[PDB]
């Protein structure tokens, strides 16, 4: 038990030569008599002795060994943010969600201590940030900044999306994507960013509109009046964004709650070139609104001429 203490000391201090002189199949998984009662692997992991960790693992150290608190060496690596140690342990089969006596996982420890880098690693290896410790608190609950909380949430949703795709779980893919911010709806009037972008008076509105669509915005989204972005753009003669909507397959004949197309609204506002653009995109001038009107029947003579030309 005198050589044991020397071995544990070699592990804590990173003394490779002394470790290998003292390490045998009989003491590789010994515990300290006092303190945390760590194994050499606990010590090497907690004090970031990468090389010692590798040699212990090569010579039979048990990644599931416990200390006085139920910690495995992964807890020690993660709590102190030693990235490389953490990955080696995981490579040699450490349980990524191992629980100590208080049901803290390695992720609890890394998040608790603001070890951002290690949390991402743990999540890539299947760490569940929803698992609760004995106080019902999850790892996200323990992240001390809102930046880490949003990152933990992002990465866990990322990995969850990949698994659901592997299983062609249409319901779950559809679920998570619905909570993406690209389709956020204004609580009262239900417009999306795409409605707001095509109505903008600022000169980057075309590039914003293109970006939103590239990132998944629904080109035919209805607001509370069932207006699409095309309706909003057409009644304002924002022709530049209407071309973007068309290129992304906007439905030219979608109907608002009055049964009106985008072309009805362009004709009502008297926007001649807009009417022309809409016709060239395949707007159907024959559609009758719920109040009984075609576009031409709502427009002035110049509008009626455009629809006739």
């Amino acid at each position: 038990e005198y050589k044991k203490d020397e071995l544990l000391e070699a592990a804590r201090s990173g003394n490779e030569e002394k470790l290998m002189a003292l390490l045998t199949p009989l003491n590789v998984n010994c515990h300290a008599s006092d303190g945390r009662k760590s194994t050499p692997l606990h010590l090497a992991a907690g004090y970031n002795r990468v090389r010692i960790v590798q040699l212990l693992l090569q010579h039979g150290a048990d990644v599931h060994a416990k200390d006085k608190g139920g910690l495995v060496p992964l807890h020690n690596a993660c709590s102190y943010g030693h990235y490389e140690v953490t990955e080696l342990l995981l490579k040699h089969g450490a349980c990524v969600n191992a629980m100590d006596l208080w049901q803290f996982t390695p992720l609890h420890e890394a998040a608790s201590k603001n070890r951002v880098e290690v949390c991402s690693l743990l999540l890539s290896h299947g760490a569940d940030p929803t698992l609760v410790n004995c106080h019902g608190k999850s790892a996200v609950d323990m992240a001390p900044t809102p930046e880490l909380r949003e990152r933990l949430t992002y990465e866990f949703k990322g990995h969850s999306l990949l698994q659901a795709a592997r299983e062609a779980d249409l319901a779950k893919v559809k679920k998570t994507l619905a909570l993406e911010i690209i389709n956020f709806k204004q609580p009262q009037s239900h417009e999306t960013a795409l409605h707001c972008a095509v109505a903008s008076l600022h000169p980057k509105r075309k590039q914003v509109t293109e970006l939103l669509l590239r990132k998944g915005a629904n080109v035919n989204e209805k607001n509370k009046d069932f207006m699409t972005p095309l309706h909003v753009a057409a009644e304002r003669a924002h022709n530049d964004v209407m071309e973007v909507l068309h290129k992304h397959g906007a439905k030219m004949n979608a109907l608002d709650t009055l049964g009106q197309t985008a072309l009805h609204r362009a004709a009502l506002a008297g926007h001649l070139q807009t009417c022309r653009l809409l016709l060239s995109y395949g707007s159907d001038p024959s559609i009758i609104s719920l109040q009984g009107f075609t576009a031409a029947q709502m427009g002035n003579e110049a509008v009626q001429q455009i629809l006739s030309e």
């Binding site: 804590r12 606990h42 004090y47 608190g69 690596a77 102190y80 943010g81 201590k113």
Partner: peptide, 8 residues
Amino acid sequence: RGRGDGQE
């Protein structure tokens, strides 16, 4: 509940 052996 103490902490585990190690250092940051």
